[PDB]
Amino acid sequence: GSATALQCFCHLCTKDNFTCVTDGLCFVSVTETTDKVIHNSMCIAEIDLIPRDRPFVCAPSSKTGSVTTTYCCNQDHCNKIELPTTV
Numbered sequence: 001g002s003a004t005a006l007q008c009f010c011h012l013c014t015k016d017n018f019t020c021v022t023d024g025l026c027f028v029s030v031t032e033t034t035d036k037v038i039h040n041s042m043c044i045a046e047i048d049l050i051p052r053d054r055p056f057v058c059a060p061s062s063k064t065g066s067v068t069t070t071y072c073c074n075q076d077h078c079n080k081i082e083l084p085t086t087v
Contacts, residue, residue: 008043008079019077024049026079027058028071041080044072062087 008026009019020043027044030037042048049055058072071082 002076003074005076006043006074006078007076008041009077010042010079011040012042019043019079022046022048025072025074026077026082027055028080028082029057030067030069030071030080032067033065039080041071043079059087 004023005021006024006026007017007019007021010016013020022043022045024044024046027048028039028041030039032038044055046052050057055072058070060068060070062068062070069083069085069087071079073079073082
């Protein structure tokens with residue numbers, strides 16, 4: 001149950017049930033710049049874990065710019081509802 005199989009509500013899914021089941025985990029990129037607020041939810045596959053040990057993409061040392069609060073979790077459908085504003 002869950003953990004290895006995550007249905008992460010994703011942005012590009014559309015007819016993919018609005019969510020895609022991953023082999024890795026859930027991942028939302030919330031990057032609110034002065035460009036726009038770029039919040040995109042994706043099902044992060046295990047292959048998409050970069051690096052595979054721990055996707056640093058979920059913790060790129062967001063210091064002040066970009067406001068990139070990356071959601072990564074192993075709960076089902078926890079995608080855009082993980083840690084509240086964690087850089």
